[PDB]
Amino acid sequence: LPAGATQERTQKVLNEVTHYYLTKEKNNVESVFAFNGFGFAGRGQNTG
Amino acid sequence: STEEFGKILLKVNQDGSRVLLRDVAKIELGGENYDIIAEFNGQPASGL
Amino acid sequence: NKFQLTPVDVITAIKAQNAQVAAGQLGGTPPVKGQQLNASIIAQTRLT
């Protein structure tokens, strides 16, 4: 997400990423471990 | 215990009534910090 | 002496007015639901 984006927003997008992986790819996907808090650019409420 | 903590005396009023910690705050077990929400298939999780 | 001050007053002033204060964030974890703003709170910065 971009600069300022609250955790709650970043969760929506994260719940979407998990949803897509749990439907459109149900056959390949085993599990999604979603981490709303830190990426690799940094830590922060706008990363995941 | 949260109960012990809430029973912390902060102030005695002029008339003799007590001002307890639970009178100014919400005691509850919780986390060291709330920066990372980690869901597993959209469920709350921990792990190593 | 003119102004009734010792080097203790000086040292106290310097530690009070030359300080780096941690002041938290607006909209920080743990968050209320429906928050759009997450910004750092900035207070005293060391003199330069």
Helix (H) or strand (E) segment spanning residue A15: helix A7-22
Identify whether C30 is preceded by a cis peptide bond (ω within 30 of 0).
yes
Residue A32, C-beta contacts closer than 8 angstroms, at least 6 positions apart = A17, A18, A21, A22, B40, B41, B42
In chain A, whose CA is at the least distance from the CA of C36? Answer: A6
What does this entry list as its resolution, in Å? 2.8
Residue A6 has, within 13 A of its CA and on its CB side, a CA count of: 15
* N- to C-terminal Cα separation, chain B: 28
Q: Where are the alpha helices (DSSP H) in chain B?
A: 2-6
**Cβ(A46)–Cβ(A3) under 8 Å?**
yes
Residue B24 C-alpha from the chain's centroid: 11
- Rounded to a whole number of angstroms, the distance from the CA of B34 to the nearest CA of chain C is 5
**CB atoms closer than 10 angstroms to residue C38:** 22
Q: Given A4, A7, A46, which is nearest C31 (Cβ)?
A: A7
Beta bridge partners, B18, equal: B12
Q: Give the three-state DSSP class for A33.
A: strand
Q: Give the three-state DSSP class for C7.
A: helix
The answer to whether C30 faces chain B, any CB pair under 8 Å, is: yes
Distances (CA, A) of A33 to B41, B42, C9: 6, 8, 56
Give the Cα-Cα-Cα angle B11, B13, B14 (nearest 5 degrees): 140
- Residues of chain C contacting B30 with CB distance shorter than 8 Å: 30
- C32: which DSSP letter? P
- A43: which DSSP letter? B
Cross-chain Cβ contact A6/C37 below 8 Å: yes
Residues 1-48 of C with CB under 8 A from A: 27-29, 31, 33-39
Beta bridge partners, C40, equal: C25
**CB atoms closer than 10 angstroms to residue C33:** 6
The string of DSSP codes covering C2-30 is TTS--HHHHHHHHHHHS---EEEEETPSS
Burial class (CB in 10 A: 0-12, 13-18, 19+), B27: middle
Q: Which residue has the tokens 């997450």?
A: C38
Specify the experimental method.
X-ray
**CB atoms closer than 10 angstroms to residue A10:** 22
Give the Cα-Cα-Cα angle C26, C31, C33 (nearest 5 degrees): 120
